[PDB]
């Protein structure tokens, strides 16, 4: 399993402690993404950030982690776009989108 997206998750209604942890304006969902190789977090962050309304929280190229905030709908589109591109273009094996 070379190129894998192992997580593409959305937190619809986060809590104070979750917002305070990331440093967000406590208004919107949070999209979380894990993929290998770890460096392609930079490419995932680019596609998530194309929405512009979406705010990039952190991009970790060492662990392969991306997080971003914004309206529930924008986050779902950003995750959906990441999964679709990486699958079709970059030939990744993607996991289904998940909600909490």
Contacts with a second copy by CB under 8 A lie at 2-4, 6-7, 9, 11, 14-18, 21-22, 30, 32, 34, 36-40, 42-43, 45-47, 49-50, 56, 58-61, 63-65, 67, 85, 89-91, 95, 98, 100
- Across 66-89, b (16+ Cβ under 10 Å) vs e yields bbbbbebebbbbbbeebbebbeee
Which residue number, 36 or 71, has a Cβ lying nearer to a second copy? 36
Least Å distance between CB 90 and a second copy? 6
Whether the Cβ atoms of residue 50 and residue 58 lie closer than 8 Å to each other: no
């Amino acid at each position: 399993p070379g190129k894998q997206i192992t997580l593409a998750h959305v937190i619809a209604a986060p809590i104070e402690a979750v917002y305070e942890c990331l440093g967000v304006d406590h208004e919107g969902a949070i999209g979380v993404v894990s993929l290998t190789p770890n460096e392609t977090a930079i490419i995932a962050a680019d596609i998530a950030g194309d929405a512009a309304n979406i705010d990039i929280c952190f991009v970790d190229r060492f662990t392969g982690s991306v997080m971003f905030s914004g309206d529930i709908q924008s986050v779902e589109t950003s995750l959906e776009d990441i999964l679709e591109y990486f699958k079709n273009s970059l030939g990744f094996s993607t996991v289904p989108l998940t909600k909490s």
